Design a binder for this molecule. Sequence first.
Ligand SMILES: *[C@@H]1O[C@H](CO)[C@@H](O[C@@H]2O[C@H](CO)[C@@H](O)[C@H](O)[C@H]2NC(C)=O)[C@H](O)[C@H]1NC(C)=O
Ligand code: NAG
Lengths: 75, 49
Amino acid sequence: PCQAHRTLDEYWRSTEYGEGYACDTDLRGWYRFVGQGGARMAETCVPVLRCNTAAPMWLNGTHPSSDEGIVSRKA
Amino acid sequence: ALNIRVGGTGMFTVRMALFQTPSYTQPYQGSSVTLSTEAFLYVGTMLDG
Ligand SMILES: *[C@@H]1O[C@H](CO)[C@@H](O[C@@H]2O[C@H](CO)[C@@H](O)[C@H](O)[C@H]2NC(C)=O)[C@H](O)[C@H]1NC(C)=O
Ligand SMILES: *[C@@H]1O[C@H](CO)[C@@H](O)[C@H](O)[C@H]1NC(C)=O
């Protein structure tokens, strides 16, 4: 878990980024969000055509607190 | 000494690919792109010859 992960340092994945078309067909596994974009990903539905992608996603709900374990969510 | 002179011609391999990202990282594997005119392009050319 917290020891086995691949960091992702992509400054373009920010909610601020204007528009692109990259699509994550190949992202497999646990990943660590690091860089200027931040440490956590989206929490509300960001408006369309952001994050270098025509149709971005987002986690609905909230981040689980510390010491909560494995949590199931539907992005 | 008998000299048999032969010749030929070859073709080098040169390509391009649309990088799906800024910083020119990942190629595009789809056969067509439908984009917004305000978005930006990111393409480069390789040399495998
Ligand atoms: C995220 O967690 C799930 C749950 O442990 C991992 O395994 C998936 O589990 C579901 C539910 O049993 C299966 O239907 C999937 O086939 C499992 N996925 C795989 C790839 O084996 C899942 O691997 C984890 N996903 C990532 C991207 O790390
Ligand atoms: C995701 O959470 C949002 C915010 O609470 C909610 O409107 C939506 O129904 C949730 N989606 C699912 C599939 O439960």
